[PDB]
Amino acid sequence: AFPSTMMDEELNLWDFLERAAALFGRKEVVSRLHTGEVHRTTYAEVYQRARRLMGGLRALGVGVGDRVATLGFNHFRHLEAYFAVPGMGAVLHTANPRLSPKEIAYILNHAEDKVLLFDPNLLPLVEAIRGELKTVQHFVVMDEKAPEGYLAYEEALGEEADPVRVPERAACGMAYTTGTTGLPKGVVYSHRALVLHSLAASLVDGTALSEKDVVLPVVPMFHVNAWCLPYAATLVGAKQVLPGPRLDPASLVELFDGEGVTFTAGVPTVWLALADYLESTGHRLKTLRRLVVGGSAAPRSLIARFERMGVEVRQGYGLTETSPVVVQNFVKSHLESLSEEEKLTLKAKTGLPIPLVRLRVADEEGRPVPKDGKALGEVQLKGPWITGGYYGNEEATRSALTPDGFFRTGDIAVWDEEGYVEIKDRLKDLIKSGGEWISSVDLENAAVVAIPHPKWQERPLAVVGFAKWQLPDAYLKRALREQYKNYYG
Amino acid sequence: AFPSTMMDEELNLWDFLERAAALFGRKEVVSRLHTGEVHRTTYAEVYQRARRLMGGLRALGVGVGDRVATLGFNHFRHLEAYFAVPGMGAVLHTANPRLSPKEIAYILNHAEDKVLLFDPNLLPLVEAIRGELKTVQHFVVMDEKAPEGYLAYEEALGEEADPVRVPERAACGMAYTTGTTGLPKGVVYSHRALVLHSLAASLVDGTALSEKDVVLPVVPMFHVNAWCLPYAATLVGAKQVLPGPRLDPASLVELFDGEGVTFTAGVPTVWLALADYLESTGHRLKTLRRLVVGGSAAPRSLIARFERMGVEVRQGYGLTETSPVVVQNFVKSHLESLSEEEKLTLKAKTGLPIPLVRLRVADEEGRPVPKDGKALGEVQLKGPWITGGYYGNEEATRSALTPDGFFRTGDIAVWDEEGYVEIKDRLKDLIKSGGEWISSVDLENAAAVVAIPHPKWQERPLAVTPEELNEHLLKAGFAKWQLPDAYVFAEEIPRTRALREQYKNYYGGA
Ligand SMILES: [C][C][C][C][C][C][C][C][C][C][C][C][C]C(=O)O=P([O])([O])O[C][C]1O[C](N2[C]=NC3=C2N=[C]N=C3[N])[C]([O])[C]1[O]
Ligand SMILES: [C][C][C][C][C][C][C][C][C][C][C][C][C]C(=O)O=P([O])([O])O[C][C]1O[C](N2[C]=NC3=C2N=[C]N=C3[N])[C]([O])[C]1[O]
Ligand SMILES: [Mg+2]
Ligand SMILES: [Mg+2]
């Protein structure tokens, strides 16, 4: 009816790195490899090599819309791939190496990945599933050297190439979730989604990411793209410290103090081990001011634990299906007058819905439940970075949405007049141990329930093809939980 | 083929207020009206009343794409209009009341505004131009009451209507700039542009806007939508303090302390008057932490004066054509170890290009100039909230764009290796006085008019009896504020910048 005079310019993830090279080219990207060695590079160097990776991947037959998979932890080569793949108009498929060999082979075949990039210490896993893969044409070891039948990352790098421009709604990356019944379900993100997501979650009431920040993603780069942290840190031009597979407290403290980390994010399990170590050694982190916890409900003790040491803890919530951030916790200005007990209770809640997200806690008919912090209902979402369905799964798609088009998280929650959400339960019958999923129904079909654990957050308990961490520790199910609520302490 | 699984949800300005009402509904919106009185409301009330304004405007015939104009200062009703008009799929035309009656009549006729909302103290101006208007059907006074032939705002409110979602690329608002040659040129903003603009400019390295902030936009809601501040403040759920037409230092100080203002934004002229007041009285602001200055190059002394009082000063740059923010100043982490003098100089610079902005300082061929902070070139921009032309003007459109699609600002600047831009000069021949444009060429025709530095205003016209020349200009339709301060005579004007260098310190300007 009335067109605007605004330029039709597309949002693109490559713009984050292109800006980082131009304005903050000298800012560092520090990586700790699997061997323990520390690698140092910069945004300018990462930008140069990411351009070389684009030309290199093109030589291997990667075109627009093609899937390029990764199996690796947090380091600079993974960060180069985080930009090169979406930069050339291809799809970054970050796969989880902690899954079963059968799960990984299924998702690589389902996504029809053309090229696989993986860490040197994950070679045995790749050697094991290689015979099962039907689409991967080139196997690339993220290192200087590669064994026979394998291509080395540094050898794979080609001539510098310009980024390919695509409509912002086009695919940039994809990830499969194991937090469902049956087969893993695929979610395909767009440039538009991840750019908007990076902006809205970086605001002051969110992560408050700044150029002055030194960012350490403890969250794996195969968990919803490390919660988009590497993208958002590049956007602001913050220094990045990538810890690799070593997430033990001594290894982290070393990077925390040595590189002057100011902001970090990870799952509760890792933070509990860190807090335990800091308390036992009487050590205080000299620069860390802000800590984000997600993936699972952060215990009240974990927050108070870190506040005691001068570390601000902010909870965040989301799904593979939501990019992932939809909810972030912060204390409102008028609620600062609350007592320390009441404030801790508020901090222990899930948090407030973030900008550009439409959140509701609703019933079976889709009607919002009372905002009294007591009535239970399902968290339902709507927005530009929330999935509208699944890739190559009609049955999973048609049950993912409500009649009025809201995504169903499968999470039972309450909400109050202040707008705070608080995850209470789960509709989907699953177990989340140390940030990773275990299917109850898949265990039963071989009764199993999720039992609270101090360390992991849930542990399976079987009442009488799977890994050792999936094995139940000890030996109409809505009652079995309330009976053994304190079986694992 | 291989699409994303992401929802096709549009970006809409209405979501800012909807979120504000649902999470921060009790947060206050405080307005000082033209009478001096202080009005208090909340985001929940504003949201409820904005819904009623949508229903009311629809009853007045406002459809999707229709233009609704405003002639008013900063208050709750303008904030309600800021959301209701775009929320119903209409276009909010924020008009500048400081422009000449002929200019206001021209821009209202050009935009084909159907409804006009105006402040009560601006009745004489509206009465003076009413006969010249051709499209305005309803005249709404932003007050409880209205004279015969005029509709009261409170009367205009109808039934609570649900917002209408339009494509994000579609128009949400428009504004005309008098910073060109000839008649004003129109720029049409989209929902997409302003939502992205509000997000990017609100980051820590920008305005760092938060729920806990108390925001006072001194920048008028008719200056590129108060620099998009009222939208961004609603987005974060910050308390809003809207000062109205009274921008004198004493009135502002009362709001700064009385409402606990933490963040504010405005033009240099306003901040110089405030600094003068605080230094003269010995009064110190008890809550102000962050001050933003834009529209003109902030003087080094102005920044130093506020930093001395504990107020952080950050420069920002933009145009009506750019929404407006494209550049924001902040000190880089590794530059914090610089001395007070070096840091102050860095703060005096324009700043760094903000996220989702493609900035370059280029020559006449379109090639980037060396990054030595010396080589001069034109600032050229590309991005989602940068205009790709002007409304209903093909000629102005093609002359404002480079072959490769960059927008030409008409600003001469230098840039360095750290990425800092510094506006040094202007290609366009104009004078910016107190944030408002004066056309030198228009003053020339009616012999030579140049911009000369001024302590208070920013630049002031100078023509190369002084009383004769004034009355001739007044008769040609020029206001008292547009008249050149002084007249200097010569013999020959070098035909085809020298005069500006010859009379640099004629008004003792800095
Ligand atoms: C840009 C940067 C930003 C960042 C910050 C924030 C962070 C936070 C986020 C996190 C998210 C997580 C992810 C995940 O986990 O996903 P998945 O795997 O798919 O899963 C989902 C699930 O889980 C759970 N959760 C989560 N989170 C949480 C939980 N719970 C409780 N709480 C919390 N927080 C649920 O269940 C879901 O569903
Ligand atoms: C939302 C958030 C908010 C933030 C804020 C920031 C600040 C920034 C803003 C400012 C901008 C202004 C705009 C304007 O002014 O427009 P116009 O009127 O159109 O004009 C344009 C012109 O002007 C000038 N400038 C501006 N700014 C500046 C300047 N100069 C120098 N410096 C500075 N800063 C130029 O010339 C342009 O062209
Ligand atoms: Mg999931
Ligand atoms: Mg202009």
PDB file of N, CA, C and O in Angstrom, chain B residues 25 93 115 118 161 170 190 194 250 348 395 501 506 509:
ATOM      1  N   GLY B  25       4.519  -3.277  32.682  1.00  0.00           N
ATOM      2  CA  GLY B  25       3.295  -2.495  32.605  1.00  0.00           C
ATOM      3  C   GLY B  25       3.173  -1.379  33.623  1.00  0.00           C
ATOM      4  O   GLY B  25       2.511  -0.373  33.371  1.00  0.00           O
ATOM      5  N   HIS B  93       3.666  10.351  10.125  1.00  0.00           N
ATOM      6  CA  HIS B  93       4.425  11.466   9.576  1.00  0.00           C
ATOM      7  C   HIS B  93       4.708  12.503  10.659  1.00  0.00           C
ATOM      8  O   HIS B  93       3.867  13.350  10.956  1.00  0.00           O
ATOM      9  N   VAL B 115      -5.003  12.724   8.568  1.00  0.00           N
ATOM     10  CA  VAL B 115      -5.276  13.211   9.916  1.00  0.00           C
ATOM     11  C   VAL B 115      -4.035  13.904  10.477  1.00  0.00           C
ATOM     12  O   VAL B 115      -2.914  13.434  10.282  1.00  0.00           O
ATOM     13  N   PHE B 118      -1.804  17.627  16.687  1.00  0.00           N
ATOM     14  CA  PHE B 118      -0.943  18.748  17.048  1.00  0.00           C
ATOM     15  C   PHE B 118      -1.111  19.211  18.489  1.00  0.00           C
ATOM     16  O   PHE B 118      -2.188  19.084  19.072  1.00  0.00           O
ATOM     17  N   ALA B 161      -8.949  -1.468  19.646  1.00  0.00           N
ATOM     18  CA  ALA B 161      -8.736  -2.284  18.456  1.00  0.00           C
ATOM     19  C   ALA B 161      -7.472  -3.128  18.570  1.00  0.00           C
ATOM     20  O   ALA B 161      -6.501  -2.730  19.217  1.00  0.00           O
ATOM     21  N   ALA B 170       7.130  -2.902   4.805  1.00  0.00           N
ATOM     22  CA  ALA B 170       6.157  -1.838   4.577  1.00  0.00           C
ATOM     23  C   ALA B 170       6.362  -0.653   5.527  1.00  0.00           C
ATOM     24  O   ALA B 170       6.918  -0.801   6.616  1.00  0.00           O
ATOM     25  N   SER B 190      10.522   1.752   7.476  1.00  0.00           N
ATOM     26  CA  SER B 190       9.757   0.520   7.588  1.00  0.00           C
ATOM     27  C   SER B 190       9.812  -0.014   9.017  1.00  0.00           C
ATOM     28  O   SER B 190      10.699   0.360   9.793  1.00  0.00           O
ATOM     29  N   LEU B 194      13.260   0.262  11.730  1.00  0.00           N
ATOM     30  CA  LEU B 194      13.273   0.857  13.065  1.00  0.00           C
ATOM     31  C   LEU B 194      13.433  -0.159  14.200  1.00  0.00           C
ATOM     32  O   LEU B 194      14.010   0.165  15.241  1.00  0.00           O
ATOM     33  N   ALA B 250      16.560  25.010  33.794  1.00  0.00           N
ATOM     34  CA  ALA B 250      15.843  24.869  35.065  1.00  0.00           C
ATOM     35  C   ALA B 250      14.736  23.810  35.017  1.00  0.00           C
ATOM     36  O   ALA B 250      14.569  23.040  35.964  1.00  0.00           O
ATOM     37  N   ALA B 348      35.949  13.178  21.296  1.00  0.00           N
ATOM     38  CA  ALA B 348      35.525  14.303  20.468  1.00  0.00           C
ATOM     39  C   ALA B 348      35.301  13.889  19.017  1.00  0.00           C
ATOM     40  O   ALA B 348      34.682  14.619  18.240  1.00  0.00           O
ATOM     41  N   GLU B 395      14.895  12.228  -9.244  1.00  0.00           N
ATOM     42  CA  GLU B 395      16.144  12.968  -9.396  1.00  0.00           C
ATOM     43  C   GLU B 395      16.973  12.959  -8.119  1.00  0.00           C
ATOM     44  O   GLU B 395      18.179  12.714  -8.158  1.00  0.00           O
ATOM     45  N   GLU B 501      37.331  30.229   6.092  1.00  0.00           N
ATOM     46  CA  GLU B 501      38.658  30.224   6.699  1.00  0.00           C
ATOM     47  C   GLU B 501      39.114  31.640   7.051  1.00  0.00           C
ATOM     48  O   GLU B 501      39.957  31.829   7.929  1.00  0.00           O
ATOM     49  N   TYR B 506      34.813  34.799  13.577  1.00  0.00           N
ATOM     50  CA  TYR B 506      34.058  36.049  13.516  1.00  0.00           C
ATOM     51  C   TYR B 506      33.035  36.187  14.644  1.00  0.00           C
ATOM     52  O   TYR B 506      32.794  37.292  15.136  1.00  0.00           O
ATOM     53  N   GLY B 509      33.485  31.707  17.624  1.00  0.00           N
ATOM     54  CA  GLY B 509      32.997  30.342  17.674  1.00  0.00           C
ATOM     55  C   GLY B 509      34.031  29.258  17.877  1.00  0.00           C
ATOM     56  O   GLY B 509      35.183  29.382  17.452  1.00  0.00           O
TER      57      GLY B 509
END
